[PDB]
Design a protein around this ligand. Sequence first.
Ligand code: HEM
Ligand code: HEM
Ligand SMILES: O=C(CNC(=O)c1cccnc1)N[C@H](CS[C@H](Cc1ccccc1)C(=O)NCCCc1cccnc1)Cc1ccccc1
Ligand SMILES: O=C(CNC(=O)c1cccnc1)N[C@H](CS[C@H](Cc1ccccc1)C(=O)NCCCc1cccnc1)Cc1ccccc1
Lengths: 455, 444
Amino acid sequence: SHGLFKKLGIPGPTPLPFLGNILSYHKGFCMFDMECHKKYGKVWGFYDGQQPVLAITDPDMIKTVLVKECYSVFTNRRPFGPVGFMKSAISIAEDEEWKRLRSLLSPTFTSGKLKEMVPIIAQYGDVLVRNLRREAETGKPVTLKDVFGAYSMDVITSTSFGVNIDSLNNPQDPFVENTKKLLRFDFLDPFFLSITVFPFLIPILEVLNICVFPREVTNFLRKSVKRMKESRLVDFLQLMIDSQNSKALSDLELVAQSIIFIFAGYETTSSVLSFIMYELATHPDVQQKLQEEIDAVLPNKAPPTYDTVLQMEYLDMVVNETLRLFPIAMRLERVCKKDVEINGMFIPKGVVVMIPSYALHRDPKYWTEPEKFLPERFSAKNADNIDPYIYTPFGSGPRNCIGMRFALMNMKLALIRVLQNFSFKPCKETQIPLKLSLGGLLQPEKPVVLKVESR
Amino acid sequence: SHGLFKKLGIPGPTPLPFLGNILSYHKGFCMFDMECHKKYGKVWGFYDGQQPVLAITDPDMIKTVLVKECYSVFTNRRPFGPVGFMKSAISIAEDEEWKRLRSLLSPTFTSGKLKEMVPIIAQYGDVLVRNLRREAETGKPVTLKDVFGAYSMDVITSTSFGVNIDPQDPFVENTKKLLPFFLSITVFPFLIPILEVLNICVFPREVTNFLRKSVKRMKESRVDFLQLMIDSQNSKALSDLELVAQSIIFIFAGYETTSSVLSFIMYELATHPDVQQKLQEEIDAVLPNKAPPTYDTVLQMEYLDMVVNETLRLFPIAMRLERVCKKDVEINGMFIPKGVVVMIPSYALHRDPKYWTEPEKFLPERFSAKNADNIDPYIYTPFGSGPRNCIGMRFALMNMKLALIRVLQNFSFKPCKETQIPLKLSLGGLLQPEKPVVLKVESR
Ligand code: HEM
Ligand code: HEM
Ligand SMILES: O=C(CNC(=O)c1cccnc1)N[C@H](CS[C@H](Cc1ccccc1)C(=O)NCCCc1cccnc1)Cc1ccccc1
Ligand SMILES: O=C(CNC(=O)c1cccnc1)N[C@H](CS[C@H](Cc1ccccc1)C(=O)NCCCc1cccnc1)Cc1ccccc1
């Protein structure tokens, strides 16, 4: 297949036999997408082994892939395996199975259901302050991925299942310990390396009961959800139970969706919160102006409500600019299920159309000083000059992030209660500037550590 | 994965791990489908390794799979590999590559193109009589599949290519050795991409080479089956490799399927002299003085059509009809998951006691116009049904009847000492006799 992009006249790095272009992943997804966007321009193609991957940067062509031709052509993501029973996960399901799951899980995050979660989240916002207060009274450094991960785990377990697992910590909580090692995509591990280079090994491992998710971690979550069924005694757990007592969702598919919601609520929320606090500490002018707005909307440390959060404009600018610099998904991918020609470009069946979100968020031909943290890009004065198909931190189209509004509300509800009582400073041991992990997923090399001062 | 039919509540034999129910194939596909038809009923399921196979016998449900939901759900047969360049064959292609090839090769056997083949076939009918005359003047039993196979090869090579090939012809020798270890692919579905990506096939590379370079030799020009594929090639489109893939299918089907059924017909005529004599009296009536058979005189003979239909009932060479359920459906109030191979036991249905009175008996009167109203077109399916039935059903029926007419005008067939009576079917995979069909040929 290594002559496909040579046939279509599409530029790209020369692929090696069998390997393709995976040798260029030594710097990670991001640095590889950045160099390819500069060298080859608006459209380039490479090979993840024998898999041709077409990278597009045109907003109109991105809109056609993500929005217009979603249900008909670009419906599924890249086939990920071996998954085993997790194939029924909404992020992994395909075609009609995903269509049924998306409609089944869409009412989970309506504006009414989200507003019901604010009082529940307000409880753990108080525990977050007291846990930050013990470490604040001492000059001891604070690992923010630990304290934000515990807060995120409590919000996702109570708002989706109505169960309190982390009672003020319990810092050795088993849900965090298992969700931590739930998945570790590292190019170094020849497993995920050989899966991409030689994909015919997937049906071997599937029949061998081999799964990319570890057994002890799946078992802990598989039996916890079975324990989490306490009826007799409307949430993410009730929407699936009610539809189950009416195809329908089996007790194994109901667990598969819970694992996706638990991981996304823990890992993604805690990672972005750590990225936000790093920029607030390295930019004291932004942190002060954000604290001044929070006090103006919530005087005397007033409790945050669903309406006051949507009122804070500068808070939305800080969250959006951090998501621009750090798109945790990095890439958006769709599988071309049939031959099409979008915007005057033929795309064969089976080619993976990829949108480099990290490279587009730092494209100099869009963002003035793209490497700099400037929240003024997202002010209502300048937000008109932002293409929603260039800035896609949550994706776009029918298969975007279903928990986008929940993640935005959960993070903003955390930043408010934290900045109401504390200020953040570097520690010298804080890695400045922040080096990104040259591995698979978007993470810092050294964990983000900061000093916490009370007010 | 062997708990699918247990989940769906569909009965069937208990599968062994990895193997499934393939150990029950020691008797053949036929006897396994018949034992499961009486033991379980209208619907049962088994496992060819890890592949669940659902067997349906309800005519309304058979019609839904073969005819109604063909283009939507039941479009392709069981995936067969490793093939290679034969993946483009019309019998193996899937979805749109099949639809484009089904439309390209459909005009090959129209009522006009078939009527053009009668004078061409009439030439080889005389050589068939002369070669049978040499073995009839001298008392020597005649291997029917050899003498019929040589006639069937010259017919398909001329009606599809116009080339004349005329006892050790390399085409018959190479086409026949497409005839063990398939027990593994039935158990190892994951080893198919191991031989596909590595470019390994099941057909030996030389039965393909001899035909791949023969088509490139017959393509030297300078409208038949070959000309239809050249004119569209000179306009997605068809390549010199896909063009060869279709020629192998037509050559094999025209040689092996025609001769095997003709051998089965003459065995029934020899074991039933009253049927052979009555058939000879009809041929002499429509065609007096051994008149040359034409296109219209063949369709006029009713008893000849009744003899061929009863033989294809007793010996359906396809044995089974199979479709792959491409997506979850609920036909006739029965949920069928995606990936299940819906199978129609044609051999078991052609001998169902709840339909055919005395099914093991050879009675051509089942297909008389008085009684042909009591047969279900979805129970008697010797050529399949629906949009993906036998594309050469009309050519095969005409070619075999033209051979039966030219022979029964001059010879009568009697059993020999070495004639296997009753005929034992091959307990292996395909439908064939154990011992070759040998019959005494007496001239008239
Ligand atoms: C800052 C936080 C988050 C960010 C930036 C983010 C980003 C994304 C992105 C870029 C996608 C892919 C969109 C596409 O391919 O078009 C996605 C998918 C998804 N996200 Fe998130 N996400 C976040 C948090 C969450 C949370 C809290 C949940 C809770 C359930 C969640 C659940 C999902 C699911 C289920 C999908 C798959 C959607 C589908 O297949 O229909 N995410 N997310
Ligand atoms: C007594 C002679 C024959 C019998 C009983 C027979 C029977 C069958 C059957 C049962 C099928 C499958 C139908 C289905 O799956 O629904 C089939 C398919 C087919 N037959 Fe035959 N056949 C005969 C002779 C021939 C001949 C002479 C040709 C010449 C080209 C031929 C070409 C084909 C092809 C190309 C297919 C596959 C068509 C497709 O899948 O779209 N057959 N045949
Ligand atoms: O990662 C590949 C396949 N990629 C390759 O094979 C590959 C290899 C080499 C080079 N390029 C590509 N698919 C994934 C889908 S599968 C993966 C499996 C998984 C991983 C972690 C926990 C649970 C299950 C999954 O469900 N994640 C969603 C978790 C929830 C979440 C996470 C983050 C944000 N919101 C929600 C693409 C993807 C989809 C959505 C968001 C991000 C990425
Ligand atoms: O045989 C399986 C796959 N079966 C399994 O894997 C399996 C294994 C164990 C148990 N059950 C199933 N498919 C085949 C399709 S492929 C096969 C390949 C082949 C073989 C011989 C010569 C050339 C190429 C093929 O093109 N034949 C058609 C020849 C023409 C013809 C022949 C006869 C009558 N008319 C026309 C199902 C089939 C289709 C049509 C008719 C009969 C059967």
